[PDB]
């Protein structure tokens, strides 16, 4: 009923826009209950939350009829209604617009700094009434699209650049989402065109070609590699489903050591494995005292069990995984390399790491703990580690999703087998509040 009309409202939107939202695990929920009673808005925080409508009016979330929940599992929750009302429809398209520009890659990374957006915004901000000398400022575009706070921080005629966008991010996301909403709601479109022509044309290009272009480019990339980025919804579903069979084919001992390995067994195991950097140097003469011998045998048995578990698992498609590390990644002598000072990545150090390591191969003799998603957990994040390894795993590699067995499921761990050869492919400085060095590696089978 009203649920159908709500669906029909969304289905008027371009299929391409809905595609981009779906790609990042975006879900659209239509509900007859209050938004704050929905499963997705359960957190105690959503109780005392407020939202601001397209026209700048504040309401309690509980009282409102649509909300784009952002973050790592984006959701658009919509109260089912008639939506014959254009005043209502425009708010849905507004939150959807926000879901696009704020929550969906790649738009939420590049778009607002794009010449096209900045150019359109500058032109609207510079509209004139007259055509000759000393023509009066025309505030019609700013009044239609710019929020209260943005009108306070930006004057008419004043120039917008990347640093102004970065300092007023949510305010420019509003401009984008409201342009989007007015463009797509048929009874608001003509006013957008009349009063902010530059932003109308900006949205017309997105609607008529460039949403589609961005979408096809995503489809193309997904054909070559699977990359969940920081989004957890699709990642967790893929991890659980893909390795379910493998998990049923583990022994009790194998499951126990997988768990133990994510806990206190981690260091003793990986230290043992890294011992001689792959050189075979037998220890001969004398013997270990009884406790050290027992401890060593125990570690050897754990490695036997982990080896056996991971041999039973094969990654079935090209996959990107993520791992945070320190400068010790490049060797013991880099321990105090001081790659990052005051949250700033030293540019010349990156140049010499690049000079020394780019193209070089190496063996990780340790098992390789990685995350199926980027930076999911406080233990291994940008704040503590100045280097993110972005690792391309080719189909056929022995590794497995172990998060549901881990003492830390929130890490979304993909455990890759020991003894693979890796290559340093690329070095990139990533800016925000700390910068970091992204190092692309590939496994070489
Ligand atoms: O040093 C440890 C672990 C030490 N540990 C075991 C547990 C108790 C003592 C403390 N590392 C190196 C860096 C790192 N980086 C990740 O991005 C990551 C992602 C995952 F999903 C899982 C593990 C990791 C790890 C694991
Ligand atoms: Cl390690
Ligand atoms: Cl490290
Ligand atoms: Na094999």
UniProtKB/Swiss-Prot annotation:
The lineage of its organism: Bacteria, Bacillati, Bacillota, Bacilli, Bacillales. One of its GO terms (molecular function) is nucleotidyltransferase activity. GO terms for cellular component: extracellular region. Its EC number is 2.4.2.-. Pfam families: ADPrib_exo_Tox, ATLF. Residues 224-445 form the TR mART core domain. It is found in: Secreted. Its main location: secreted. One of its GO terms (biological process) is symbiont-mediated killing of host cell. This is Putative ADP-ribosyltransferase Certhrax. It comes from Bacillus cereus. Gene3D superfamilies: Collagenase (Catalytic Domain), Toxin ADP-ribosyltransferase, Chain A, domain 1. Residues 1-208 form the ATLF-like domain. The active site is at 323, 369, 380, 413. Keywords: Glycosyltransferase, NAD, Nucleotide-binding, Nucleotidyltransferase, Plasmid, Secreted, Toxin, Transferase, Virulence. It is an enzyme of class 2 (transferase). A probable mono(ADP-ribosyl)transferase; it is not known which residue is targeted for ADP-ribosylation. Upon expression in yeast cells causes cell death. NAD(+) binds at residues 262-274, 323-326, 364-366, 380, 413.
